[PDB]
Amino acid sequence: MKRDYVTTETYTKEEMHYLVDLSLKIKEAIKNGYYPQLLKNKSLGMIFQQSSTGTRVSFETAMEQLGGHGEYLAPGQIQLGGHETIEDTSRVLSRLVDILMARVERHHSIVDLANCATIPVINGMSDYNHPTQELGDLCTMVEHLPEGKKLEDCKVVFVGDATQVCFSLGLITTKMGMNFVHFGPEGFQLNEEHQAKLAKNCEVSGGSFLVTDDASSVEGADFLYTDVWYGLYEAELSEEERMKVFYPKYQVNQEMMDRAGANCKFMHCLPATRGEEVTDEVIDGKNSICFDEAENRLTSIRGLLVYLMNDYEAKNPYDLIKQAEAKKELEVFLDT
Amino acid sequence: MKRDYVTTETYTKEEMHYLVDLSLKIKEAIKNGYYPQLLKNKSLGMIFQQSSTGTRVSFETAMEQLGGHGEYLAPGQIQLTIEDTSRVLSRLVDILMARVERHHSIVDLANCATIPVINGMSDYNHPTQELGDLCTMVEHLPEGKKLEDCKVVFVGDATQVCFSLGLITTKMGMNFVHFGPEGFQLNEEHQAKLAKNCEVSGGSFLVTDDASSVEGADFLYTDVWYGLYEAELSEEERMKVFYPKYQVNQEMMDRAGANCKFMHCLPATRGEEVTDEVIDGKNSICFDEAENRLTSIRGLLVYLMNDYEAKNPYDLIKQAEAKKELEVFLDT
Amino acid sequence: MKRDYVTTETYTKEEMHYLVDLSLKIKEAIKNGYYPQLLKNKSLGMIFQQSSTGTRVSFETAMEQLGGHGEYLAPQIQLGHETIEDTSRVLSRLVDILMARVERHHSIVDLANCATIPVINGMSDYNHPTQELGDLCTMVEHLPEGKKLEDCKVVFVGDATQVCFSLGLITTKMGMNFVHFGPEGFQLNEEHQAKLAKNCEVSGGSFLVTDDASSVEGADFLYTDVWYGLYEAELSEEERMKVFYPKYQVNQEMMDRAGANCKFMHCLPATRGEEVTDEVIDGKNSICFDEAENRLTSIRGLLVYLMNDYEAKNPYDLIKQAEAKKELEVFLDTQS
Ligand SMILES: N[C@@H](CCCNC(=O)CP(=O)(O)O)C(=O)O
Ligand SMILES: N[C@@H](CCCNC(=O)CP(=O)(O)O)C(=O)O
Ligand SMILES: N[C@@H](CCCNC(=O)CP(=O)(O)O)C(=O)O
Ligand code: NI
């Protein structure tokens, strides 16, 4: 028996709070030079169907810091297209590593992997969502709360394209009872299915959501968040096309930040295209927190790995009598 | 001085029994949550000239579990003179494995390296598969039968895995059959090596295209039909040679016997060498077999490194002196 | 605050002696089976823009031996769409130390300038400083009977490769006598020679760049490298034979002309039958495989030095460490 981390839709507000608290406590230990060896001798399979810097390095570093090891399985090493291949691969890998992550081209691949594997599976980004980004961004907002405001009192505005990161930000903010806005142009907004999921979250949490092309919607934002304009890895929009759609209205510049408010913080999942979605002035300015945010990709990944492996061990406990017997038998064999 | 693991031809029945016993004891420790740190701070160079999932992940995981680390050197990263590469790597890692296109490459690597070398599969044999398969057969012995009483039938192409299965089964005193079509059977040189094994072990071997040869099998084993990595047989060509006679289906399993277990080294081509019904059925053990790739690799790594240390022992007086000198240097 | 290792030009003779002594003491500990865990739980990002065997394996092995881990990044992470500043800031939050083998020297200079963690040059088109330290360790271990380091003559034969220049830089820094024996159009240039001259004004060493075959006479170490030039733009076999063969082939005649006790060095890989003959590279006076081993020797010393420097400049607060450890333990004991 295992638990997966494919979407925050299967996690409650209270569970997300626990993950944040766990992640931040591990962070404070490591920041002061204590590395808790919570994944000693454990192996993570890391399946990447696309390129990655932040996610890949975070997983590999996290495993080392916690006493285990991450194995990088590059694009083309593992095919996740067809159910039959995915079932066989899942069953082989489940016997060979303790935990799995995958960054996939199509969301059904990560859903299928999690369904077939008997070990925990983590979504490292798909075309649909990006749940490790969600947890990292939540950690970051908690660390940068406005003076005298609670999390649920905050307004978070995503500017631009309806990327998987846009949707994921909507999912986590509404799950935590916050106020979310997607400020984006017609034809590039979160769709009806996206909005129904955000509505369902708000019906439980007391938060709110709005999807609009009204420029005034940035006003009062505590966090202003953006992402690239070129769309999906496999099928990018050209420079000329994306400028036509988004520029200059959706460029996060100092004017937009000032319209949001003097204390509004700037966030971006990275990598950023400077001179497009954001200007140098904003991303390098005093109210940019996007490099703290990048660090918190590692923060959240450490907490997730520990949570999922602790869950696995609680559901599949070791028998300490048989452990002692097995250790003694091995030692006797190697001595005699 | 070192020892290598290039072929089971250089290992006795007693040595293979020791490797099985070591592998299974490590397995039982880890299964119950004790990870023996027998390779602490040791580095394994992993040279892959061809793709791999099972072998590669097994080596990398094994090193982590035992307290060391495996370095994945992907296809094209290391050109394989072989003498120069061997001498360089021998100074930079503690142990080496390689999956190679041509068997002479692994023989040359082992000859030139001054550290232990493990064959991760060649065009000739696949000795880590042999040990894993042996572990699996031991764990799944038929009720009231000894290993040497068992019959193992390989169906289909004369792959390096086919030959390797022949080598290990005959080495352990078992009864081996290659059921395959004319032009795709184990050759005269293969059979002479199997005969030599049987003269020592009291086992037997048979190579035949007679469909009745599966009868009485305790283990029925198969592999893909598309041949070597660098020169695959097309779908049309391989179906013409092997289908349907050599497809392991439920009819063939029933002909072998109600209790016959199904094995496959993986990956499998469902609908060719084996049907979904068989590979997913109650008598399939091929996923236990896949797990035992890691089982056997852990045992091999420990055996070879223990052997290396016995032949090249550490001087504890010089160790103590070196430690003190380093500590004084870093303090002062 | 950090220190980098991009060029030995920023290191004094006394600092290079310290690195040699540290490297050799770690070597003697490991040789006798004591692995000092000086980089426990630390992560090294290894950026390779080009192929490598010796350098790559040395870094990955060194990290394991010292209790940490090296992450191999293939042309996964590009130095492109995202600026060097942005990539440097992201990686600085995710690993503890960085190395890179780069096509163009400015890339490693920029990475070092922008990163807030130590950066090591794993070879560029300009220099190869880890090779320098490994070669120095090797010369120290193989000093001629009754000679001091500064009494030795080192002759590099052939093309003016980055290894040629680097050998010039380290030998002149240590007060030795350096010669580049190479043909017109393939010699160290005026800028190279000005840097060697500056080193010699401080050290009392000497340098010479010449196409005179008699310049090998009296050499204690004779060093060579391949003839095919840079990774991205190799010289053909026909072209390079025309330039270098047979005059610059290191054969037994040349070794005898240098001296009966002259040792042969080569950074590897070698093209047998071109720059060197089988007889020389496999002969009794070849030390190039000890030299190859000392790539690992020197890399271990460098990693320890740079991380010790980093920790001295950024010390852990032991009171806050104790508090963070306690809070984590309480959280894991009491919460769920
Ligand atoms: N919408 C963007 C999201 C990238 C998020 N970035 C990360 O996760 C950091 P990484 O890619 O370096 O791991 C896209 O589809 O590319
Ligand atoms: N005859 C087959 C044997 C494959 C063996 N499989 C394994 O070792 C599992 P892996 O390739 O994932 O490591 C062939 O030549 O392809
Ligand atoms: N002039 C040579 C220098 C190679 C140095 N070799 C090494 O550093 C060993 P490696 O490449 O295996 O890491 C060139 O430009 O290729
Ligand atoms: Ni690794």
PDB file of C-alpha atoms in Angstrom, chain C residues 100-257:
ATOM      1  CA  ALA C 100      31.804  23.148 -15.406  1.00  0.00           C
ATOM      2  CA  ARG C 101      33.684  22.064 -18.484  1.00  0.00           C
ATOM      3  CA  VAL C 102      32.919  24.762 -21.066  1.00  0.00           C
ATOM      4  CA  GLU C 103      33.447  25.411 -24.782  1.00  0.00           C
ATOM      5  CA  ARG C 104      34.349  29.096 -24.278  1.00  0.00           C
ATOM      6  CA  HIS C 105      36.252  30.462 -21.284  1.00  0.00           C
ATOM      7  CA  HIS C 106      33.913  33.433 -20.764  1.00  0.00           C
ATOM      8  CA  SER C 107      31.173  30.973 -19.766  1.00  0.00           C
ATOM      9  CA  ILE C 108      33.097  29.680 -16.729  1.00  0.00           C
ATOM     10  CA  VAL C 109      34.200  33.225 -15.807  1.00  0.00           C
ATOM     11  CA  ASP C 110      30.546  34.380 -15.914  1.00  0.00           C
ATOM     12  CA  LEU C 111      29.301  31.360 -13.923  1.00  0.00           C
ATOM     13  CA  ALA C 112      31.933  32.028 -11.224  1.00  0.00           C
ATOM     14  CA  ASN C 113      31.151  35.755 -11.136  1.00  0.00           C
ATOM     15  CA  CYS C 114      27.393  35.251 -10.726  1.00  0.00           C
ATOM     16  CA  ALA C 115      27.259  32.138  -8.515  1.00  0.00           C
ATOM     17  CA  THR C 116      27.354  32.672  -4.736  1.00  0.00           C
ATOM     18  CA  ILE C 117      28.873  29.194  -4.210  1.00  0.00           C
ATOM     19  CA  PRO C 118      32.381  28.015  -5.209  1.00  0.00           C
ATOM     20  CA  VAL C 119      32.911  27.336  -8.929  1.00  0.00           C
ATOM     21  CA  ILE C 120      35.617  25.078 -10.407  1.00  0.00           C
ATOM     22  CA  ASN C 121      36.799  25.189 -14.040  1.00  0.00           C
ATOM     23  CA  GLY C 122      36.834  21.605 -15.418  1.00  0.00           C
ATOM     24  CA  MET C 123      38.576  22.813 -18.620  1.00  0.00           C
ATOM     25  CA  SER C 124      37.894  25.567 -21.163  1.00  0.00           C
ATOM     26  CA  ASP C 125      39.442  26.581 -24.486  1.00  0.00           C
ATOM     27  CA  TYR C 126      41.828  28.808 -22.458  1.00  0.00           C
ATOM     28  CA  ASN C 127      43.126  26.742 -19.506  1.00  0.00           C
ATOM     29  CA  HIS C 128      42.739  23.547 -17.421  1.00  0.00           C
ATOM     30  CA  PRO C 129      43.544  24.347 -13.811  1.00  0.00           C
ATOM     31  CA  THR C 130      42.603  20.979 -12.186  1.00  0.00           C
ATOM     32  CA  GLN C 131      45.039  19.370 -14.621  1.00  0.00           C
ATOM     33  CA  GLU C 132      47.680  21.846 -13.341  1.00  0.00           C
ATOM     34  CA  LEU C 133      47.266  20.773  -9.724  1.00  0.00           C
ATOM     35  CA  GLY C 134      47.246  17.063 -10.618  1.00  0.00           C
ATOM     36  CA  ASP C 135      50.407  17.488 -12.709  1.00  0.00           C
ATOM     37  CA  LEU C 136      52.092  19.398  -9.867  1.00  0.00           C
ATOM     38  CA  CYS C 137      51.228  16.602  -7.401  1.00  0.00           C
ATOM     39  CA  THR C 138      52.724  14.119  -9.874  1.00  0.00           C
ATOM     40  CA  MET C 139      55.977  16.066 -10.345  1.00  0.00           C
ATOM     41  CA  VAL C 140      56.364  16.382  -6.566  1.00  0.00           C
ATOM     42  CA  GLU C 141      55.947  12.599  -6.208  1.00  0.00           C
ATOM     43  CA  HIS C 142      58.497  11.964  -8.996  1.00  0.00           C
ATOM     44  CA  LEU C 143      61.212  14.534  -8.237  1.00  0.00           C
ATOM     45  CA  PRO C 144      64.642  13.600  -9.646  1.00  0.00           C
ATOM     46  CA  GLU C 145      67.131  12.371  -7.020  1.00  0.00           C
ATOM     47  CA  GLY C 146      68.568  15.352  -5.127  1.00  0.00           C
ATOM     48  CA  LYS C 147      66.686  18.069  -7.046  1.00  0.00           C
ATOM     49  CA  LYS C 148      64.259  20.640  -5.710  1.00  0.00           C
ATOM     50  CA  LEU C 149      61.081  21.403  -7.671  1.00  0.00           C
ATOM     51  CA  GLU C 150      62.432  24.820  -8.735  1.00  0.00           C
ATOM     52  CA  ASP C 151      65.609  23.193 -10.142  1.00  0.00           C
ATOM     53  CA  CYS C 152      63.553  21.145 -12.644  1.00  0.00           C
ATOM     54  CA  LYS C 153      63.046  21.689 -16.379  1.00  0.00           C
ATOM     55  CA  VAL C 154      59.646  20.867 -17.911  1.00  0.00           C
ATOM     56  CA  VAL C 155      59.304  20.742 -21.691  1.00  0.00           C
ATOM     57  CA  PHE C 156      55.932  20.618 -23.410  1.00  0.00           C
ATOM     58  CA  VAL C 157      56.118  19.277 -26.978  1.00  0.00           C
ATOM     59  CA  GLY C 158      53.668  20.054 -29.784  1.00  0.00           C
ATOM     60  CA  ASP C 159      50.491  22.129 -30.053  1.00  0.00           C
ATOM     61  CA  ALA C 160      49.730  25.184 -27.902  1.00  0.00           C
ATOM     62  CA  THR C 161      46.695  23.580 -26.256  1.00  0.00           C
ATOM     63  CA  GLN C 162      44.994  24.848 -23.105  1.00  0.00           C
ATOM     64  CA  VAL C 163      46.965  22.112 -21.265  1.00  0.00           C
ATOM     65  CA  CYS C 164      50.228  23.501 -22.711  1.00  0.00           C
ATOM     66  CA  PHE C 165      49.415  26.976 -21.415  1.00  0.00           C
ATOM     67  CA  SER C 166      48.225  25.650 -18.041  1.00  0.00           C
ATOM     68  CA  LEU C 167      51.452  23.663 -17.608  1.00  0.00           C
ATOM     69  CA  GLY C 168      53.340  26.881 -18.362  1.00  0.00           C
ATOM     70  CA  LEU C 169      51.285  28.767 -15.768  1.00  0.00           C
ATOM     71  CA  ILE C 170      51.800  26.264 -12.921  1.00  0.00           C
ATOM     72  CA  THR C 171      55.497  25.538 -13.592  1.00  0.00           C
ATOM     73  CA  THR C 172      56.377  29.252 -13.745  1.00  0.00           C
ATOM     74  CA  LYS C 173      54.225  29.933 -10.647  1.00  0.00           C
ATOM     75  CA  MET C 174      56.260  27.316  -8.719  1.00  0.00           C
ATOM     76  CA  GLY C 175      59.616  28.750  -9.855  1.00  0.00           C
ATOM     77  CA  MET C 176      60.494  26.010 -12.360  1.00  0.00           C
ATOM     78  CA  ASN C 177      61.927  26.205 -15.888  1.00  0.00           C
ATOM     79  CA  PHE C 178      59.365  25.833 -18.670  1.00  0.00           C
ATOM     80  CA  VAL C 179      59.750  25.298 -22.405  1.00  0.00           C
ATOM     81  CA  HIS C 180      57.169  25.058 -25.150  1.00  0.00           C
ATOM     82  CA  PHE C 181      58.800  23.255 -28.038  1.00  0.00           C
ATOM     83  CA  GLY C 182      56.352  23.781 -30.920  1.00  0.00           C
ATOM     84  CA  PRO C 183      56.215  24.758 -34.606  1.00  0.00           C
ATOM     85  CA  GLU C 184      55.636  28.270 -35.984  1.00  0.00           C
ATOM     86  CA  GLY C 185      51.919  29.089 -36.022  1.00  0.00           C
ATOM     87  CA  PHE C 186      51.221  26.651 -33.191  1.00  0.00           C
ATOM     88  CA  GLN C 187      53.258  28.252 -30.375  1.00  0.00           C
ATOM     89  CA  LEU C 188      52.035  30.021 -27.214  1.00  0.00           C
ATOM     90  CA  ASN C 189      51.122  33.563 -28.296  1.00  0.00           C
ATOM     91  CA  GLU C 190      52.287  37.021 -27.077  1.00  0.00           C
ATOM     92  CA  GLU C 191      49.507  37.278 -24.432  1.00  0.00           C
ATOM     93  CA  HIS C 192      50.365  33.785 -23.115  1.00  0.00           C
ATOM     94  CA  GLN C 193      54.044  34.678 -22.902  1.00  0.00           C
ATOM     95  CA  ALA C 194      53.395  37.984 -21.093  1.00  0.00           C
ATOM     96  CA  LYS C 195      51.534  36.023 -18.395  1.00  0.00           C
ATOM     97  CA  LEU C 196      54.408  33.524 -18.114  1.00  0.00           C
ATOM     98  CA  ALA C 197      56.878  36.442 -17.896  1.00  0.00           C
ATOM     99  CA  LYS C 198      54.874  38.016 -15.091  1.00  0.00           C
ATOM    100  CA  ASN C 199      54.915  34.703 -13.164  1.00  0.00           C
ATOM    101  CA  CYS C 200      58.716  34.419 -13.622  1.00  0.00           C
ATOM    102  CA  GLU C 201      59.335  37.976 -12.345  1.00  0.00           C
ATOM    103  CA  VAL C 202      57.770  36.879  -9.055  1.00  0.00           C
ATOM    104  CA  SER C 203      59.024  33.256  -8.862  1.00  0.00           C
ATOM    105  CA  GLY C 204      62.567  33.311 -10.280  1.00  0.00           C
ATOM    106  CA  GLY C 205      61.577  30.620 -12.799  1.00  0.00           C
ATOM    107  CA  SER C 206      62.037  30.837 -16.576  1.00  0.00           C
ATOM    108  CA  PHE C 207      60.178  30.199 -19.818  1.00  0.00           C
ATOM    109  CA  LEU C 208      61.038  29.705 -23.499  1.00  0.00           C
ATOM    110  CA  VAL C 209      58.858  29.229 -26.593  1.00  0.00           C
ATOM    111  CA  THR C 210      60.818  27.818 -29.562  1.00  0.00           C
ATOM    112  CA  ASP C 211      60.915  25.453 -32.563  1.00  0.00           C
ATOM    113  CA  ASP C 212      64.513  24.397 -31.792  1.00  0.00           C
ATOM    114  CA  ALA C 213      64.731  20.605 -31.346  1.00  0.00           C
ATOM    115  CA  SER C 214      67.693  20.966 -28.935  1.00  0.00           C
ATOM    116  CA  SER C 215      65.395  22.656 -26.367  1.00  0.00           C
ATOM    117  CA  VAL C 216      64.358  19.209 -25.032  1.00  0.00           C
ATOM    118  CA  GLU C 217      67.913  18.595 -23.767  1.00  0.00           C
ATOM    119  CA  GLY C 218      68.179  18.490 -19.957  1.00  0.00           C
ATOM    120  CA  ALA C 219      64.395  18.069 -19.426  1.00  0.00           C
ATOM    121  CA  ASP C 220      63.342  16.326 -16.210  1.00  0.00           C
ATOM    122  CA  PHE C 221      59.736  16.030 -17.399  1.00  0.00           C
ATOM    123  CA  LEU C 222      58.698  15.828 -21.049  1.00  0.00           C
ATOM    124  CA  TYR C 223      54.973  16.453 -21.590  1.00  0.00           C
ATOM    125  CA  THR C 224      52.731  16.239 -24.666  1.00  0.00           C
ATOM    126  CA  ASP C 225      49.077  16.361 -25.779  1.00  0.00           C
ATOM    127  CA  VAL C 226      47.003  15.562 -28.868  1.00  0.00           C
ATOM    128  CA  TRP C 227      47.363  17.411 -32.177  1.00  0.00           C
ATOM    129  CA  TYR C 228      43.741  17.604 -33.310  1.00  0.00           C
ATOM    130  CA  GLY C 229      42.977  20.890 -31.523  1.00  0.00           C
ATOM    131  CA  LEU C 230      39.655  21.987 -30.055  1.00  0.00           C
ATOM    132  CA  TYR C 231      36.645  19.727 -29.434  1.00  0.00           C
ATOM    133  CA  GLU C 232      34.283  21.800 -31.592  1.00  0.00           C
ATOM    134  CA  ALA C 233      36.707  22.237 -34.540  1.00  0.00           C
ATOM    135  CA  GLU C 234      39.202  19.368 -34.821  1.00  0.00           C
ATOM    136  CA  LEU C 235      42.107  19.347 -37.305  1.00  0.00           C
ATOM    137  CA  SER C 236      41.973  16.394 -39.713  1.00  0.00           C
ATOM    138  CA  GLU C 237      44.529  13.574 -39.569  1.00  0.00           C
ATOM    139  CA  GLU C 238      46.128  14.658 -42.866  1.00  0.00           C
ATOM    140  CA  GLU C 239      46.392  18.306 -41.799  1.00  0.00           C
ATOM    141  CA  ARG C 240      47.827  17.668 -38.333  1.00  0.00           C
ATOM    142  CA  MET C 241      50.395  15.118 -39.585  1.00  0.00           C
ATOM    143  CA  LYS C 242      51.548  17.776 -42.085  1.00  0.00           C
ATOM    144  CA  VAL C 243      52.021  20.295 -39.205  1.00  0.00           C
ATOM    145  CA  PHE C 244      53.598  18.104 -36.502  1.00  0.00           C
ATOM    146  CA  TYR C 245      54.964  14.807 -37.897  1.00  0.00           C
ATOM    147  CA  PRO C 246      57.652  13.555 -37.415  1.00  0.00           C
ATOM    148  CA  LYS C 247      59.512  16.414 -35.662  1.00  0.00           C
ATOM    149  CA  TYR C 248      57.110  16.741 -32.709  1.00  0.00           C
ATOM    150  CA  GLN C 249      56.492  13.022 -32.167  1.00  0.00           C
ATOM    151  CA  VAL C 250      57.739  12.043 -28.722  1.00  0.00           C
ATOM    152  CA  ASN C 251      59.703   8.870 -29.505  1.00  0.00           C
ATOM    153  CA  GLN C 252      62.542   7.057 -27.708  1.00  0.00           C
ATOM    154  CA  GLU C 253      65.117   9.152 -29.611  1.00  0.00           C
ATOM    155  CA  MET C 254      63.595  12.351 -28.178  1.00  0.00           C
ATOM    156  CA  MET C 255      63.438  10.905 -24.651  1.00  0.00           C
ATOM    157  CA  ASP C 256      67.109   9.871 -24.893  1.00  0.00           C
ATOM    158  CA  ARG C 257      67.962  13.380 -26.160  1.00  0.00           C
TER     159      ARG C 257
END
